[PDB]
Design a protein around this ligand. Structure first.
Ligand SMILES: *[C]C1=C([C])[C]=C2C(=[C]1)N([C][C]([O])[C]([O])[C]([O])[C]OP([O])(=O)OP([O])(=O)O[C][C]1O[C](N3[C]=NC4=C3N=[C]N=C4[N])[C]([O])[C]1[O])C1=NC(=O)[N]C(=O)C1=N2[C]C1=[C][C]=[C][C]=[C]1
Ligand SMILES: *[C]C1=C([C])[C]=C2C(=[C]1)N([C][C]([O])[C]([O])[C]([O])[C]OP([O])(=O)OP([O])(=O)O[C][C]1O[C](N3[C]=NC4=C3N=[C]N=C4[N])[C]([O])[C]1[O])C1=NC(=O)[N]C(=O)C1=N2[C]C1=[C][C]=[C][C]=[C]1
Lengths: 494, 499
């Protein structure tokens, strides 16, 4: 029954909010729909794998909030293997390379690849992180899919193929499904193309020893009986003095304030009294999450390292079930494994197969790409289709179709009376990530502290000191990268 | 508690299913979220208006199922006023015309307008009504917005402007929001461009005397206590022998079968056990409804008729709050009124204003369009914003953004164990309309009768005899209309001669 704040959802965002409020002296309850905490993070333990992340997993430089929270909880990170060569597999053949970016040798193609990435970052600099709908060309870019943008910008099929794979991997959606404004904002608010795609010095630098699921589990340990598992919220009543929150199993909770820490569209699962205002009522029907199967194949040894491959593969083509892989071997060098993502329309297509049929397709692919028969002899397989989850709706995050961000965007974190909004989707830096979940949960908690007169308005949005354990190198561009002409630019110059 | 079939939703689709099942001898319960039946149809009665439809309203030729159902219930139709001239207002000026279509004088613009409508219908003929994702070019057309299709097809701004207003009016959404495959399907399954847009011989020919809300109300009268108002469904359990359906007010219903007769995305409001299959789970998050305010301004007299205007206005321009109007005077000639739609992004924009501020904007617009100061003296005003409705989500219907129809389309009316799907969105002829609600409700009911061994598979989909009261004239094209070249076609024909 009675408390100061009810938090709906026990993922990273809901747990970070509740921890903050608890640490401030307020009485808090977390209502969680599933029989576990963690939401879009999930760590499986069994004897074969020891532990494995089946949801969110990677952290890296500039993600200072998730790094500080995990450190305080007693977690350690380790580095993803990127010692040996990366592989770019294109038109049925493998090209090993070093550095973050796959090299291009044809000169025209070179100019086209260079101009595409540069243009993405240029366009991003006109987009405010906390208000993308205030971009000078907000409407024009929002009324256009990423597919239309790629068609205009890319003068070669080679650049257009790589840019498409880039979109599919970042947001688990097809280029024709997503707004150009929304995708450019998304990349920008992660620090740009280089920062988002890199292992070393980027979003994929590190993982947590023991799994990322420990973040939510350890906060639940701190909160004890305040966390209520298998309590899906069905009903929120704001007509009276205290807010009334009802669960599916017929319990009633009473509070001064609520934080909703669930993906925006999952707000549909709740019946509101009084009805939601018009813009939010419609927004929550307009914001799907992407589609992905995360798959991990285990091997006796990390045999790719013997051929001077790190295990990172960038794989083009319609036939490949998996477009991107990373080494998932434990820091000690055992439980050798390759992690890969089956993205967007391939997730829909390959979900019809059996677990065993998917394993066979992956092994045959890895054998071609790595040039090794050893890939045909897996010792174990784990996978998770996020599309089938009632209380997630997909992964990694919410995407915006064309027209939606400019029309409904400003409503995402706008309070509805005594309901405040957290969840990674409402963040302004690494929104879509575990980092964004922490930002949003702690910000929504402070909005409530301010409404209670406990802190100045000044203190709702708080900056984060840089991690000493995971420092960031700055992103640099060369003179030639900055000044080489586009393909049409070279044509004008002719 | 116990019955044969629980129907979720008391709109036209849910009420048509329940009536069919009841007439067959089964015990049915209808669970309705609101304190009223009718859903996206709603008839307001007060002394000033007598009655007025604030939601779905128009019916016309080829809509035989809604006409038969209403006739059996004892309802009458009357004809929408189209006796005098239509108006096309473009670039701040009005051009009166007769006939269904605004005339085009410039021969280039004329070739462009002719080729646009023709191409829409040509592309539609490649799209199966019952399976749009089977079109030969389904993927290509689905990966493209209507805005991209218009940019490629229309070689004049004038054709592009009119085509845009056409999309906004048909599906209450912007061209950049909707799949090209979905929109071409939607028009095709209503019988094509002419049938969808027309008053005389089209979708807008008629209304029901007394209002369309009487359809649902009269079925409720037939069913008596079997209809449960203010019972929003929150939970469906299929793990046991009988299906368990729970409501928000804590009642439990038990049944052999369930029909879900709610817009697909409103399925999100229900918690399922076991969880929905993957494709449905994701589909219901990908299918929004459009945005519209329906507004009716009353006058002492239908003064536009005196100037030889019927009251139909097609109004282009960003400044105009309303893009389309119809005479909404009663068949007896009293309660003179103009009905207009505020569509898509304007519904969002103008919802910020007060009721009085919106009234003033409309009157000032009608005064320019009709050239009449009388338009500035309204006697009464009614309106309804559908965007604010928790148990509709918008109006008129569900649209599909790019990429969705080909990936998730085939799952819309696919049964999930003992749950069968009705609602106008699952229809194959006039989906989006009251007609489609009847088709879908009656088909879902017969799917259940078949599962119960009461009818052959053969009988699930049933054709409908043509209405004798509202007959359909066929849609004809002239020789010139069929064979005049497009703009690029004329240009090719100029490249060829010179050589
Ligand atoms: C899935 C995934 C994958 C596969 C991968 C990845 C990911 C994912 N990511 C993402 C993450 O994870 C995220 O962001 C996070 O986690 C989020 O968080 P939040 O905000 O908190 O949210 P969530 O989790 O979802 O939670 C929520 C909750 O709630 C609940 N509910 C619902 N409903 C309800 C409830 N309750 C009560 N009632 C009701 N009604 C649920 O259940 C839950 O719990 C990521 N991230 C990062 O950071 N990293 C990584 O790695 C990741 N991953 C990704 C990527 C990869 C590559 C590149 C990029 C990215
Ligand atoms: C809105 C509108 C307007 C404004 C106009 C119009 C329209 C609309 N339209 C459409 C119609 O109306 C429709 O289609 C119909 O109505 C549909 O039906 P259905 O399918 O049945 O569906 P609904 O109605 O929605 O119902 C449902 C129900 O359910 C319920 N719920 C929900 N949720 C829930 C429930 N319950 C329990 N639980 C839960 N969870 C609700 O409440 C409801 O009741 C139209 N149509 C026609 O035909 N005509 C016309 O006129 C119309 N309009 C239109 C137009 C105009 C112009 C052109 C074109 C068109």
């Amino acid at each position: 029954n009675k408390c100061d704040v009810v938090v709906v959802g026990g993922g990273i965002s809901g747990m970070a909010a509740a921890k903050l409020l608890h640490d401030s002296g307020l009485n808090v309850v977390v209502l969680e729909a599933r029989d576990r905490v963690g939401g879009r993070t999930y760590t499986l333990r069994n004897q074969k794998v020891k532990y494995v992340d089946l949801g969110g997993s990677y952290v890296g430089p500039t993600q200072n909030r998730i790094l500080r929270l995990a450190k305080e909880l007693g977690l350690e990170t380790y580095k993803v293997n990127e010692v040996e060569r990366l592989i770019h597999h294109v038109k049925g053949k493998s090209y090993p390379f070093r550095g973050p970016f796959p090299p291009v040798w044809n000169p025209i193609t070179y100019l086209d690849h260079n101009n595409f990435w540069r243009t993405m970052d240029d366009m991003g600099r006109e987009i405010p992180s906390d208000a993308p709908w205030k971009a000078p060309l907000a409407e024009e870019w929002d009324n256009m899919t990423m597919k239309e943008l790629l068609d205009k910008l890319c003068w070669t099929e080679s650049a257009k193929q790589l840019a498409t794979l880039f979109v599919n991997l970042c947001v688990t959606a097809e280029t024709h499904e997503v707004s150009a404004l929304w995708f450019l904002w998304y990349v920008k608010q992660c620090g740009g193309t280089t920062r988002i795609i890199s292992t070393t010095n980027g979003g994929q630098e590190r993982k947590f020893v023991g799994g990322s699921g420990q973040v939510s589990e350890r906060i639940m340990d701190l909160l004890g009986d305040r966390v209520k598992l298998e309590r899906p919220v069905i009903y929120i009543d704001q007509t009276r003095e205290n807010v009334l929150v009802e669960t599916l199993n017929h319990e009633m909770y009473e509070a001064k304030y609520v934080i909703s820490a669930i993906p925006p569209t999952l707000g549909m699962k709740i019946h509101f009294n009084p009805p939601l205002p018009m813009m939010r009522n419609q927004m929550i029907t307009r914001v799907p999450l992407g589609s992905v199967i995360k798959c991990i194949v285990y091997y006796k040894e990390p045999f790719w390292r013997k051929k001077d491959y790190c295990g990172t593969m960038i794989i083009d083509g319609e036939e490949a079930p998996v477009a991107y892989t990373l080494d998932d071997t434990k820091p000690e060098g055992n439980y050798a494994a390759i992690m890969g993502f089956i993205l967007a329309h391939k997730a829909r297509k390959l979900a019809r197969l059996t677990k065993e049929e998917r394993l066979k397709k992956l092994c045959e692919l890895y054998a071609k790409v790595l040039g090794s028969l050893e890939a045909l002899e897996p010792v174990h397989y784990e996978e998770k289709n996020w599309c089938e989850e009632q209380y997630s709706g997909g992964c990694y995050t919410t995407y915006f179709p064309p027209g939606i961000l400019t029309q409904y965007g400003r409503v995402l974190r706008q309070p509805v009376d005594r309901i405040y909004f957290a969840g990674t989707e409402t963040a302004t830096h690494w929104s879509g990530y575990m980092e964004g979940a922490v930002e949003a949960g702690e910000r929504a908690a402070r909005e409530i502290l301010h409404a209670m007169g406990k802190i100045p308005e000044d203190e709702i949005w708080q900056s984060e000191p840089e991690s000493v354990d995971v420092p960031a190198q700055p992103i640099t561009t060369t003179f030639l990268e900055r000044h080489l002409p586009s393909v049409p630019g070279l044509l004008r110059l002719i």
